[PDB]
């Protein structure tokens, strides 16, 4: 029963070091070369490094060469990835994979490299320019989640709060839009109610038509 279990991942700031481990069992670990493969959220697979069955030779991708070091302890049936001088672009799930025709992968371990701390969002109105669309921009906050309502919850029809984008800086940004009739744009008032509990930020922003 082949089994690979990665560990050592977590949240770290750029420039710091992290050591990943992959415990192997159910097969002769010392007879197989081993790979590290990573996958940033929503992106493709990227090969990271490879080590021969006996550790005699090591191979690295250019993006990690000089910063990561692959190693293995065959007496311990464990594979290691020493990651130094970590950068934001190293954020990814890191998988441990055997080398061969019939290969096996572990479940992966998540690595998040970010210098982001608790921060409340900056809310900006998305003014509308017989159905017109208006919203708010909830910009640069950390961590999730953010709750957005309209008119203290009285306006729920046609509301679409989009999932947040995770920026390279490690901060989040989302937008909430409401589709309303163009006729009620001059009479009705539209307030988006933003709440960011981690930073104790609650904002009520009024969205008005753009006028010179």
């Amino acid at each position: 029963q082949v089994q690979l279990v990665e560990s050592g991942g977590g949240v770290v700031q750029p420039g710091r070091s992290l050591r990943l481990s992959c415990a192997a069992s159910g097969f002769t670990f010392s007879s197989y070369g081993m790979h590290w493969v990573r996958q940033a959220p929503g992106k493709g697979l990227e090969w990271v490094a490879f080590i021969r069955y006996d550790g005699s030779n090591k191979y690295y991708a250019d993006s990690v060469k000089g910063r990561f070091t692959i190693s293995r302890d065959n007496s311990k049936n464990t594979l290691y990835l020493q990651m130094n001088s970590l950068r934001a672009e190293d954020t990814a799930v890191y998988y441990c994979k055997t080398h061969g025709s019939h290969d096996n992968w572990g479940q992966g371990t998540m690595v998040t490299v970010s210098s982001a701390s608790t921060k409340g969002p900056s809310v900006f109105p998305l003014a509308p320019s017989g159905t017109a669309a208006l919203g708010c921009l909830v910009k640069d906050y950390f961590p999730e989640p953010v709750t957005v309502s309209w008119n203290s919850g009285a306006l729920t029809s046609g509301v679409h709060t989009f999932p947040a984008v995770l920026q390279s800086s490690g901060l989040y940004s989302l937008s909430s839009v409401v589709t309303v009739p163009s006729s009620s744009l001059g009479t009705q008032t539209y307030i988006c109610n933003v709440n960011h509990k981690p930073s104790n930020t609650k904002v009520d922003k009024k969205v008005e038509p753009k006028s010179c």
């Binding site: 929503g42 490879f50 025709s101 019939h102 992966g108 998305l126 919203g135």
Partner: protein, 216 residues
């Protein structure tokens, strides 16, 4: 360095046949064998094909691999709902070399509803944000199926590389997909061009929305 190009999205109805291409060069696919992997959400890739066309035990024979010249292909004959997933080809670059080259990845959608083009809404930077010496263009994309889009930003007519942040498609409450793309600009860049455009390509068709600084 070397890239194995795959189509971003392929789709077919249940029971239909789809193929996924994997284009390389003489050095890699032209000189090495190809693997194919299936990846479901939140799990590690799973081996489907090795040695170009060999199926591991337990892989249904409706998954068939082939290779010719510098290109490889994965065919799925008789799509089933469970086949909706990401698919990656994998090969090597030199002779008897160990570094793995993974393809760009293909999202396979098993069509459970008619194809739907995205609705695009492009918002300019608000006055409050520009007063803070910041500028963000918000391109909101909704009600499209399959859930695969490519977003391209244009300054006037020139492509924009820096400042783009795009989410992965997520299924809406109405079971269509939504995505958002943000273009971070300085107030000077936003006012030094006559317009900015968000181009959303979906199933070969492009939907463009343009915004200008003058219009208030």
């Amino acid at each position: 360095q070397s890239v194995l190009t795959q189509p971003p999205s392929v789709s077919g109805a249940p029971g239909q046949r789809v193929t996924i291409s994997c284009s390389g060069s003489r050095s890699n696919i032209g000189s090495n064998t190809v693997k194919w992997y299936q990846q479901l959400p939140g799990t590690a890739p799973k081996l489907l094909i090795y040695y170009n066309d060999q199926r591991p035990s337990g892989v249904p024979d409706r998954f068939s691999g082939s290779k010719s010249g510098t290109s490889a292909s994965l065919a799925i004959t008789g799509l089933q709902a469970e086949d909706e997933a990401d698919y990656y080809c994998q090969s090597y670059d030199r002779y008897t070399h160990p570094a793995l080259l993974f393809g760009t990845g293909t999202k396979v959608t098993v069509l459970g509803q008619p194809k739907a083009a995205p609705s695009v809404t492009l918002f300019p930077p608000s006055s409050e944000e520009l007063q803070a010496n910041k500028a963000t263009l918000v391109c909101l994309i909704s009600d499209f199926y399959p859930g695969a889009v490519t977003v391209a930003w244009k300054a006037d007519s020139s492509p924009v590389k820096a400042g783009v942040e795009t989410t992965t498609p997520s299924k809406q409450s109405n079971n269509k997909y939504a995505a958002s793309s943000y273009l971070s600009l300085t107030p000077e860049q936003w006012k030094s061009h006559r317009s900015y455009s968000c181009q959303v390509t979906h199933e070969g068709s492009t939907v463009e929305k343009t915004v200008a600084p003058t219009e208030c």
